[PDB]
Amino acid sequence: MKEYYITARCTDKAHNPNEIFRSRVFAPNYVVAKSKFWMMLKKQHKVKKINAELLQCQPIFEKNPTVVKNYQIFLRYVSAGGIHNITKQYRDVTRVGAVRQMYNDLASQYRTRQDKIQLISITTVGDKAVKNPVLHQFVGHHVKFPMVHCKPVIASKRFNLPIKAGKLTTKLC
Amino acid sequence: SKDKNRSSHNQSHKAHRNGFYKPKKSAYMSTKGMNVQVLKNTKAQRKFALAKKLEAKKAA
Amino acid sequence: CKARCQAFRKEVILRTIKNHKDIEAAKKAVYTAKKNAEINGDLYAEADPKLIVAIRIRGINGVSPKIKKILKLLRLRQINNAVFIKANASTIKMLRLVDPYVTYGYPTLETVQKLIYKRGALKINGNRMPITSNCMIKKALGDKDVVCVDDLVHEIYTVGKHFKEVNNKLAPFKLNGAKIAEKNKKIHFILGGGFGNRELLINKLLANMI
Amino acid sequence: IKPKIVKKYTGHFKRFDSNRFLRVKASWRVPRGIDNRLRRKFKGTNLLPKIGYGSAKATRNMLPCGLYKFPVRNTTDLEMIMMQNRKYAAEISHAVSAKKRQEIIQRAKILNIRVLNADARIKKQEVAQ
Amino acid sequence: PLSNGRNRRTRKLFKRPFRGHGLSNTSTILHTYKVGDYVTILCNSSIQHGLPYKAFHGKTGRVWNVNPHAIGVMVNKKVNNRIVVKRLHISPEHIKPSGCQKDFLERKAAVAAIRKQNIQLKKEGKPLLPLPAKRLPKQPRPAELIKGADIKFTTVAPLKFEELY
Amino acid sequence: AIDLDRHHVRKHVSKTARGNNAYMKLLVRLYGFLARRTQSKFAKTILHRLCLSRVNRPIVSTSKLACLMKKHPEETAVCVNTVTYDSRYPVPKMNVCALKFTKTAEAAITKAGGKCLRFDELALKAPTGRKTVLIRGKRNVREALKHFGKVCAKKNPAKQYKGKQTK
RNA sequence: CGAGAAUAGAAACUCUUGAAGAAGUAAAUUAUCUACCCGUCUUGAAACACGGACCAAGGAGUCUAACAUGGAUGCGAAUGA
RNA sequence: AUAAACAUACUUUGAAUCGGCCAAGUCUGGUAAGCAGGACUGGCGAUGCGGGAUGAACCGAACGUCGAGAUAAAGUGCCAAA
RNA sequence: AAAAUGAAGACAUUUUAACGAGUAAGGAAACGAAAUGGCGUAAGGACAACAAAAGUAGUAAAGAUUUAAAGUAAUUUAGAU
């Protein structure tokens, strides 16, 4: 999952060649980003690739991929019944990192595959605007929990024997 | 004992094996059933040019 | 006797300098133009690609009669076969029709060089002979002003005036096998599949295939 | 000097169903049946003679000793391979008597020609001799 | 299952154009056809006499003979696995001047104009003009600069789903 | 596999003298060597015609040689076939190289003052072909060509193989 | 630093096994993988469709007459007799 | 624009065959049918190989005898290679 | 398929390149660069020790049973009884 900045213009009778269409598209690569970008133009402004020129398709990186932020993804997906608008909150350090979480959450809770979800916008909310019941318990400064029933950690697959000698124990960790 | 009446299945594939034989150029140059006066003009001139050419060959 | 071998060798050296000068000067001009647009706050639209490399992905069984003819006109008659295709409004539509059976994109100069040097061949007297000498290239393409392999590469990459005659001489490269897709080759590359337009990502697939 | 004689299949191509029925001999016959298991090349039974099994042309029809075979019926037959003693080998015919076999054998040693039946139709010099 | 009538399945093929009934044009009978021209067979149902077969409707043919009231037309017909030459005699009420070579004919005029100048320049010493460039498919567009003084930006994002009820 | 238009089958061109004629096999060898080395279209043409079948090597009469060389007096007609004699018209003086001369044809050419050369003589005198006129006989004058087709045809009917009660 | 070019530069070796049986090949057995009854009509048979208990010998596009095409042959306005 | 010289155009003689069946981002009769009949294409028939446990048609891919390598559909707890 | 060579080598010549699934069906003989290549049964006409005693055979024929070798195969070859 990567984020791209794509611009283009339409040069034909219908559209003046002075209107630039910008976008911020989350795509696995840059070929998919243009594919998403063109369909947005075709379904909204009747602009087709045969009558348009791309200008700049540059990757966008996180300025501070070390600061924890609370996100708020506004999205619309298609179900068996109809189309719905949903808002989901996520905690991550990168914009692209949170989007992959949204895709994995949507595909599990709602069983909605990737070719039904359209991301309208993604912003950053404060520490009190989180409304997810599970995620609201981890925004405070005084949060602590004893991680228990830990499986003992193996340093690497090198020491992973199939049969072990002696009893096996879990960890208060 | 009913049978299947007709099918075009595998008929375009059969037709394109030895493909559409185009007519030769000699087919487009036929002049049967043309204008009677136009035909008379052509025959009259072709007899005039032929006689003149054959006379010169005869002299030498 | 063979004093012309040194003379022929020098002409290859002189022409190679001219070829590299043309490619580097054109590449430099793009970089300078891009900077001035950034300085002036303008917008720069990169020129559309001219050369397309296409690879046959699917087999030969179960192809529509119209799709079967296009793959013959592009000389993609075998699975794992690569050809170079001129990009225009004619061949772009032709490739879209045969999309499920091909993957294509825009190759880099390094990709073009390695394809010709390692897998290149020519059709001489109806024989698919691999490239082994510049005399074999001078004989085949003498009248087209192509005497060295680096002249063969330069014409292909820049799409010169004699591209069609030069490109037709080259036999379609027979590539190896490589991981075609992430999901499978039954969907478009946009969906994670194998076929379709890969744009500049065809070089990664070609690297594992050459 | 002798090259490596390489055979692509050292077994025998046995007729189909020859093992089950005795009226069916082991000499190969291509199955023409419309439902034959072998001729449709089923897994397990797809062993048929093909031109691809042919051995190398350089080392074809060559005996393990490194030479070809040239049958002889008399001493004068040996005179046709005296120039090629390094390429051919004499093979006395199966009907040549014991008296004539010695004359061929003696002359072959004189002409330096190998004989593949050098110990054939010999007398009783194995017991009491 | 259809019948083998001559004019079967002509409820829509042989119908006149909407508000196109009555008499035809006058230029239809005044157009001068010459041998070698390209014509289009268009069966006019308003004239039942000499109506061509319904299979040749819309076919483009070449004039091969001119007769006092009929114009000879020669079109190609497709048979089992071959192609045959069909020769017809059609009144002008059923044919039409084809425009297939309209683009080709103007290119000949453009070349003939340039060539006529090249005979006015070579003898007089001036450099001779070249022939017009050949047609090519839409080529890849070249690089160009876009000014940032008269430009404007409009953002594009997926639209929030709005119900139509 | 590979998707081809067709598979390679033997090309339908003969490259040797058909039959076991020891002399026609020698002419093919003689002109196969001439065409390969001299690389002249004439020797290639003669080599190609020497390998045609008998039905494709039609005869040329002395009447046709006379008319073809009327404006070519210092020439040598070359026809790869039997040369027959037309008993209705005179034979002028001319040198003819041919595979075979009919007894009445050779006498007519010799008596008129001409020369009857074989093909090994021509290769000795004009190998590449210098004073030669290439001549071949008519192929469509065969009686078999009349019956080829369907006689019911409206344009070019066949000629109706005769048989029981043919009226 | 140095491409072209001119002058000088160079590779002939070890150890093990074998007429006390080497390398390869064959037969028998064992082990892993693999293998439905042949012929036939049929869209489709391993078929709950038919013939087949086993073996030997016999066993089925031949001859005469007319026509045509085609490949080799002789002669040629003649050819055959 | 692209492809095409073992290209292209054929000529003559003639074999077998016209019981077909299947799939479907197709249709008509029928409640429906592994039912009956059609338009376009691809297949089985005539076809083995790898996968779906087993399967005429599905997926990959069509076959001279082999050695080595990346691969396809698809799989990676054991049967079962991962 | 194309180039090279070619009175006789030999393996049905040398080199290069592409190709090689298959029911019904077709590819008669001959054709030096050969217009598919061959195995087997019987009978007829010739050839088979070139110095005037000229293929094998009571110093063991044909047949039969097996052991091995050559050929992709049809089959051939030799040993022992």
PDB file of C-alpha atoms in Angstrom, chain A residues 7 11 24 31 43 50 65 73 78 94 99 103 109 115 126 150-152 157 160 163:
ATOM      1  CA  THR A   7      -2.396  15.342 -11.733  1.00  0.00           C
ATOM      2  CA  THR A  11      -7.425  18.764 -23.903  1.00  0.00           C
ATOM      3  CA  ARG A  24      -4.239  11.390  -3.520  1.00  0.00           C
ATOM      4  CA  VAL A  31       0.052   1.543 -12.314  1.00  0.00           C
ATOM      5  CA  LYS A  43     -17.218   8.677 -13.909  1.00  0.00           C
ATOM      6  CA  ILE A  50      -7.544   9.111 -24.992  1.00  0.00           C
ATOM      7  CA  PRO A  65       6.601   7.915  10.638  1.00  0.00           C
ATOM      8  CA  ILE A  73     -11.360   7.061   7.305  1.00  0.00           C
ATOM      9  CA  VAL A  78     -21.343  -1.938  -1.508  1.00  0.00           C
ATOM     10  CA  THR A  94       1.541   6.147   8.742  1.00  0.00           C
ATOM     11  CA  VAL A  99      -5.418   2.224   5.114  1.00  0.00           C
ATOM     12  CA  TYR A 103      -8.987  -2.932   4.113  1.00  0.00           C
ATOM     13  CA  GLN A 109     -16.125  -7.866   9.617  1.00  0.00           C
ATOM     14  CA  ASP A 115     -13.309  -3.928  -5.310  1.00  0.00           C
ATOM     15  CA  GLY A 126      -7.818  13.987  18.522  1.00  0.00           C
ATOM     16  CA  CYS A 150       2.354 -15.551  26.214  1.00  0.00           C
ATOM     17  CA  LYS A 151       3.753 -18.308  24.066  1.00  0.00           C
ATOM     18  CA  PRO A 152       7.538 -18.376  24.635  1.00  0.00           C
ATOM     19  CA  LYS A 157      13.587 -20.695  13.015  1.00  0.00           C
ATOM     20  CA  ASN A 160      12.727 -24.443  16.200  1.00  0.00           C
ATOM     21  CA  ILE A 163      10.203 -32.375  19.409  1.00  0.00           C
TER      22      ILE A 163
END
